[PDB]
Design a protein around this ligand. Structure first.
Ligand code: JYG
Length: 273
């Protein structure tokens, strides 16, 4: 089932998420990624309409893999005795945003605007399909280097979107909002907007703004790089201490700093090729 249909290549990476290998679908040589997760290392489980116990990530990816998007597509999945295996699409050539930022340092605002806009479109798509990622960060974003298109990855910390409080969190701490640090309580959209503020700061400054819990709680933003006043304003708004003071996704995309975004292909020509 798995062995015959996919030819396995080298390990791309491993960590809390499991182990991800490059691969190729044997039938048509389609590039793929193959994610293995041990059953013991999965805490968040869900059920398919069919009535089958699977990892939540499988439920979430099926809900968002409908149509095209800036979300990594689940092509197939398999259950094994002690693990689940997910077959994901693989752009070629590709680089993850963390490595891209590390190599360039801070991104030019024009580039950060295009990237951030695409992340916003992808996150909006997730929320429309009832899915909350809960771990938005540069490490969970891939760049299709030829087309200039960003793709969200790793829904292993995610959940079904709801309007009530979340009391569990498995995402990355330094991207987590002050309300989680202080009260172990947050709401979906406003916590997501906090992580987007951290991401945007990361793009235009070349690193995250807060390291320790006390910096997150204080919420004072210091700019280490030259950043436009409009971009600083949007960042500070996303990082409002009070969740209800943070912008909606609509307010983010109507912010003056977000106007006249480049198309992804233009973005590649000017900034990537
Ligand atoms: C972060 C990890 N967790 C996931 O769910 C997932 C999916 C991928 C993944 C999917 C498709 C393509 C790539 C890919 O090309 N790469 C590269 C080799 C371009 C960086 C990587 N690198 C990572 C983030 C694993 C270390 N992951 C992919 N990586 C992860």
């Amino acid at each position: 089932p798995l062995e015959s249909q996919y030819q396995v290549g080298p390990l791309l990476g491993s960590g809390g998420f499991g182990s991800v290998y490059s691969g190729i679908r044997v039938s048509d040589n389609l590039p793929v990624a193959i994610k293995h997760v041990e059953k013991d290392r999965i805490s968040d489980w869900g059920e398919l309409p069919n009535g089958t116990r699977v990892p939540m990530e499988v439920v979430l990816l099926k809900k968002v893999s409908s149509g095209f998007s800036g979300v990594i597509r689940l092509l197939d999945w398999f259950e094994r005795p002690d693990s689940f295996v997910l077959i994901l699409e693989r752009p070629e050539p590709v680089q993850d945003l963390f490595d891209f930022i590390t190599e360039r340092g801070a991104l030019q605002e024009e580039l950060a605007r295009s990237f951030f806009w695409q992340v916003l479109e992808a996150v909006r798509h997730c929320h429309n399909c009832g899915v909350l990622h809960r771990d938005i960060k540069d490490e969970n974003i891939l760049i299709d280097l030829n087309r200039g298109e960003l793709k969200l990855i790793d829904f292993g910390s995610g959940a079904l979107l709801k309007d009530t409080v979340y009391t569990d969190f498995d995402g990355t701490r330094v991207y987590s909002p002050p309300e989680w640090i202080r009260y172990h309580r947050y709401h979906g959209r406003s916590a997501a907007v906090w992580s987007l503020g951290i991401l945007l700061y990361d793009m235009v400054c070349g690193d995250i703004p807060f390291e320790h819990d006390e910096e997150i709680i204080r919420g004072q933003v210091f700019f280490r790089q030259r950043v436009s006043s409009e971009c600083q304003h949007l960042i500070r708004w996303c990082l409002a201490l009070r969740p209800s003071d943070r912008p909606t996704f609509e307010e983010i995309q109507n912010h003056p700093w977000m106007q006249d975004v480049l198309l992804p292909q233009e973005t590649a020509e000017i900034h990537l090729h």
